[PDB]
Amino acid sequence: NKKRKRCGVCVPCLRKEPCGACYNCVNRSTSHQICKMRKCEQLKKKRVVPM
DNA sequence: GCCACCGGTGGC
DNA sequence: GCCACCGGTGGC
Ligand SMILES: [Zn+2]
Ligand SMILES: [Zn+2]
């Protein structure tokens, strides 16, 4: 299988802007991680099978 | 080139 | 043995 995509319909997916205050927003330059408030509810579940 | 998922792992 | 952290890179 392939990498999973965001769902588009949970509250975080619907957020227009980054929150600007979580650990990942404060470390924008460094982080390869999405704003904690934009993280898709569906992607917080571990993959049923890995890659 | 950017966004950001996710396998791999160091420190506990 | 867990898991927060990271960084390579898939997908656009
Ligand atoms: Zn944030
Ligand atoms: Zn979502």
> Is there a contact between A15 and A37 (Cβ–Cβ < 8 Å)?
yes
What is the residue type of A13? C
Alpha-carbon distance A35 to A20, whole Å?
Answer: 8
Closest CA to A34 of A2, A3, A1, A6: A6
> Is there a contact between A7 and A42 (Cβ–Cβ < 8 Å)?
yes
Please indicate the experimental technique that yielded this structure.
Answer: X-ray
Instruction: For Cα atoms A26, A40, A36, give the angle at the middle one, nearest 5 degrees.
Output: 15
Q: What is the dihedral of CA A43, A44, A48, A51, to 10 degrees?
A: 60
For the CA of A41 and the C1' of B5, the distance in angstroms is 13
Q: What are the sequence ranges of the domains in chain A?
A: 1-51
Judge if the beta carbon of A16 is closer than 7 A to nucleic acid strand C: no
Judge if the beta carbon of A33 is closer than 7 A to nucleic acid strand C: yes
Q: Which nucleotide lies nearest residue A31, CA to C1'? A: C6
Alpha-carbon distance A48 to A32, whole Å?
Answer: 23
Alpha-carbon distance A19 to A25, whole Å?
Answer: 7
